[PDB]
Design a protein around this motif. Structure first.
Motif, PDB file in Angstrom:
ATOM      1  N   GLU B 174      -8.180  40.170   5.007  1.00  0.00           N
ATOM      2  CA  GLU B 174      -8.601  41.453   4.470  1.00  0.00           C
ATOM      3  C   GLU B 174      -9.181  42.299   5.595  1.00  0.00           C
ATOM      4  O   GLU B 174      -9.743  41.778   6.562  1.00  0.00           O
ATOM      5  CB  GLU B 174      -9.628  41.272   3.345  1.00  0.00           C
ATOM      6  N   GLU B 176     -11.227  46.280   6.027  1.00  0.00           N
ATOM      7  CA  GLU B 176     -11.797  47.502   5.488  1.00  0.00           C
ATOM      8  C   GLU B 176     -12.186  48.382   6.662  1.00  0.00           C
ATOM      9  O   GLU B 176     -12.815  47.905   7.613  1.00  0.00           O
ATOM     10  CB  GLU B 176     -13.025  47.209   4.621  1.00  0.00           C
ATOM     11  N   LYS B 178     -14.354  51.688   7.174  1.00  0.00           N
ATOM     12  CA  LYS B 178     -15.332  52.504   6.509  1.00  0.00           C
ATOM     13  C   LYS B 178     -15.887  53.639   7.342  1.00  0.00           C
ATOM     14  O   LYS B 178     -16.204  53.450   8.455  1.00  0.00           O
ATOM     15  CB  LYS B 178     -16.433  51.608   6.108  1.00  0.00           C
TER      16      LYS B 178
ATOM     17  N   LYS C 108     -16.327  52.013  11.282  1.00  0.00           N
ATOM     18  CA  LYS C 108     -16.672  50.616  11.078  1.00  0.00           C
ATOM     19  C   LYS C 108     -15.449  49.898  10.513  1.00  0.00           C
ATOM     20  O   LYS C 108     -14.987  50.224   9.416  1.00  0.00           O
ATOM     21  CB  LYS C 108     -17.868  50.492  10.138  1.00  0.00           C
ATOM     22  N   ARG C 109     -14.923  48.936  11.263  1.00  0.00           N
ATOM     23  CA  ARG C 109     -13.706  48.220  10.886  1.00  0.00           C
ATOM     24  C   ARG C 109     -14.023  46.736  10.790  1.00  0.00           C
ATOM     25  O   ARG C 109     -14.428  46.118  11.781  1.00  0.00           O
ATOM     26  CB  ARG C 109     -12.596  48.486  11.897  1.00  0.00           C
ATOM     27  N   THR C 110     -13.850  46.173   9.597  1.00  0.00           N
ATOM     28  CA  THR C 110     -14.257  44.805   9.309  1.00  0.00           C
ATOM     29  C   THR C 110     -13.041  44.001   8.881  1.00  0.00           C
ATOM     30  O   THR C 110     -12.388  44.338   7.886  1.00  0.00           O
ATOM     31  CB  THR C 110     -15.328  44.767   8.218  1.00  0.00           C
ATOM     32  N   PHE C 111     -12.736  42.951   9.636  1.00  0.00           N
ATOM     33  CA  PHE C 111     -11.693  41.999   9.297  1.00  0.00           C
ATOM     34  C   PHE C 111     -12.324  40.703   8.808  1.00  0.00           C
ATOM     35  O   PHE C 111     -13.400  40.299   9.264  1.00  0.00           O
ATOM     36  CB  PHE C 111     -10.798  41.667  10.500  1.00  0.00           C
ATOM     37  N   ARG C 112     -11.635  40.041   7.877  1.00  0.00           N
ATOM     38  CA  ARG C 112     -11.997  38.699   7.434  1.00  0.00           C
ATOM     39  C   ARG C 112     -10.938  37.749   7.963  1.00  0.00           C
ATOM     40  O   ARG C 112      -9.762  37.861   7.604  1.00  0.00           O
ATOM     41  CB  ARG C 112     -12.098  38.615   5.912  1.00  0.00           C
TER      42      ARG C 112
END
Lengths: 248, 247, 247
Positions: B174, B176, B178, C108-112
Motif C-alpha cells: 500500500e 499513500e 498525503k 508525505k509519501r508512505t509505503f507499507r
C-alpha cells in the motif's frame, strides 16, 4: 617491426577520433613513420574510403625508429581506447613482441596489450577529384540534417548554388529541406564553381557523422554525380577524411 | 486558407504537443483569429483532451480565414522533436493540403507534413459539479502516480478540508501520498465536501508523462465523477484532460 | 512504536541499500538501541556482506522494542528508489507485520512493505591474517574491474611494499592496473609482505557497482585468502564485503 613510443595528451579525445573511423571499418593498417601516423581503409561494401592522418606535431612524445605498418582490429582497439579518461595521457608503445601496448596514465597506470593482426592492404589512393562545390559548416547542422532526412528517405540530395547550400530529402508524401546561406550561423564558407547536385546514402552519412563534434568545422567537397569528400581536423593538424560514393 | 503562425522556442512547442499525443493518435486543430484549439478523445474514449493556444502566445499570428486541419499526432510529434530549444517554429499553410513546419535557428529546416481528415465528433467539455479543487506541483503528481503504480492499477483520490490524499493498495502493499497546505507541494486546496474517487493509473501516467516537475497542475473532481486536470502553457495556453472515473 | 528511525537524505540511503542488494536477495535487519546491522551471504556463499549503521548517522533514533525484521531486498530497494535526495526517510515498525517507509519532502509519501521470514544463518565476520592493506579511490577500483572484464573472468591482486597491481590475462589479451603512492588513486598502502591473490570479476563487479567514484575504499587481503572491501557511510556507518578467493 621496430619499437616505437607515441604519446597523446587526452586519451578520450583520441578514442573519439578512432571511434569515428571504426564506425565504418573493421580492420585497418596503420603506417607509422617519423612524420606521423596514417591510416587508409575502405568499408566492407567499398562505398566509403577513410583516410586518417595524425602528424607527429599533435603528439607530446613521438619516437619512431623505423617506419612500419601494423594491423589492428578496430573493434578491439576502440573497446580498449574507450576506457581512457579525458585527462589520461595515452601511450601507444611497441616492443620486440607482436602486440601494441596501450597505456592510460592518470589517477593510475593502466596498461592493455592488444595483439597485432595481419591486414592485407588494398591499393588505395586518395585521388584529387575535380570537386565543383565546397561547404564548411558546423557539425551540428550536418548531423541534424542527416537525422532530419532519415525521417523522410534513404538518400539525401546535396545542392550547392552561389549563395545557398541545400540538403533535400523526399519520401512518398513527406519532404525536408535544410537550407544555409552565409547569413546563417551554421555556414562558415561556401564556394561553388557551378551549381552542383548530388545525392548520398543516409545510412553511410549517418555512420560518417556519428562521431563528429557539434562545434567541429566540417568541410564538404562534392560535384554533380561525384563522390562526397568530408573532412574535419584534429588539433588543427591531424585530419580525418571520408570519401563517399554518390547514390546513382 | 493561408495562415502563418510563429512560436518562439520550438522544443517547448514540441513538448506541449508531446503531452497530447501520449493519449491521442489523430486530432483536428481549429485555427481561428483568436488562437489554435484542439479537442480529441483517446481511442478507448476514457479521456477527453482540450488544448487552447491563444494568439497571445505566438510571436506572429496571421490567419486569413478560420479553418480546421487534421493531423496525425505521431507524425507531427516526430517532426516537432527535431526542433531545438532556441529554434523559432513557423507553422504555415499555403493553398495546398500540407502543413509547412519550419525551424529557424543555425539553419532553416523545412518539413512538409501532409494533412489528413479526422472524424470530428460530438465533443464538448461540460462543466460538472466538482466538489474539490487541488493545485499541486507536477512533481508531486508525477511521483504519486509512479509510486502507486508499484502497488496497483488504480489510484484513489480523497479530498478533505485540510488534506488531499492519493492512495493505492495491492493485495499486501500500500502507498499513500498525503498533502496539507503546510506542504510545499500543495499550492491550493478548496474542498466543499469530502470527495472520493478513483482513476486508472495507466491513463494518469500517460496524462502526466509530459508535465514538467515545476508546472503547476490544477485538479478538479467529485465523488465517482471524472477528474479534470489542467495546466497552463506560457500562462495563457491551457491543456485540459477530463478522465472518466473507474468503477 | 517498536522503533522509529529517521535518516536525512532518502536517496543516499537508497544508494547504500542498493549496493547490498546487488549480491543478496533477502536479509535480516537487527534493530537495536545502538544502531542497525545486517549480515548476509550471496546465493553462492562466495560473498559475505556486513552493514552497520550506528544511531549516530540518524537524525532521530528511537528503539522502544528491539527486534529483527526480514526484508526482501528487491522490494525494499524498489520503494527506496522512490525517495528524493532531499527527502527525509522514516522507517517505522508498528505492532503489525510490515515496515512503514515514509518520505517527507514536498509531500508525505508512505509505503507499507510487508516483512518476510528469512532463514538466518549464524554468520560470523572473522578476523583474518591479512598481509596487505590498500586504500584507493572508488573510481580506480571500479575502472580496474571494468578493464579486467574485457580480458578475463578473474583479477589477480598483487601487493608489494611500494606498489599495488591488479592484473588480468586472457588467452592472448592482458591488462595491468598499477598504483604507487605517487599516484592520485592510491591513498594508503601497507604491505607486511608480498601478497598475491585472485578473485572472480563477476563478484567484484557486483560489489563495486554501487560504490561512488569519489568514495574511499579499503581493501585487505592475503595470499590465497579472502578479500575484505569496506567503505564508510557518513564516516560512521560501514559496508563490508568479504569475498572468497578464487581457485
Amino acid at each position: 617491426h621496430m619499437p616505437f613510443e607515441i604519446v597523446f595528451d587526452g586519451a578520450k579525445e583520441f578514442a573519439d577520433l578512432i571511434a569515428t573511423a571504426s564506425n565504418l571499418i573493421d580492420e585497418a593498417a596503420f603506417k607509422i613513420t617519423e612524420e606521423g601516423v596514417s591510416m587508409r581503409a575502405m568499408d566492407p561494401s567499398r562505398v566509403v574510403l577513410i583516410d586518417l592522418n595524425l602528424p607527429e606535431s599533435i603528439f607530446s612524445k613521438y619516437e619512431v625508429e623505423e617506419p612500419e605498418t601494423i594491423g589492428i582490429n578496430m573493434d578491439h582497439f576502440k573497446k580498449i581506447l574507450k576506457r581512457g579518461k579525458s585527462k589520461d595521457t595515452l601511450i601507444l608503445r611497441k616492443g620486440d613482441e607482436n602486440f601494441l601496448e596501450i597505456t592510460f596514465e592518470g589517477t593510475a597506470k593502466r596498461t592493455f596489450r592488444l595483439p597485432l593482426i595481419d591486414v592485407e592492404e588494398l591499393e588505395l589512393e586518395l585521388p584529387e577529384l575535380p570537386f565543383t562545390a565546397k561547404v564548411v559548416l558546423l557539425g551540428e547542422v550536418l548531423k541534424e540534417a542527416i537525422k532530419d532526412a532519415s525521417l523522410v528517405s534513404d538518400s539525401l540530395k546535396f545542392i550547392a548554388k552561389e549563395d545557398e547550400f541545400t540538403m533535400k530529402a523526399e519520401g512518398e508524401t513527406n519532404e525536408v529541406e535544410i537550407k544555409l546561406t552565409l547569413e546563417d550561423e551554421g555556414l562558415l564558407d561556401l564556394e561553388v564553381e557551378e551549381e552542383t547536385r548530388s545525392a548520398y546514402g543516409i545510412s553511410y552519412l549517418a555512420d560518417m557523422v556519428k562521431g563528429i563534434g557539434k562545434a567541429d568545422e566540417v568541410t564538404l567537397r562534392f560535384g554533380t554525380e561525384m563522390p562526397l569528400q568530408m573532412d574535419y581536423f584534429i588539433r588543427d593538424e591531424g585530419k580525418l577524411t571520408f570519401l563517399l560514393a554518390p547514390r546513382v
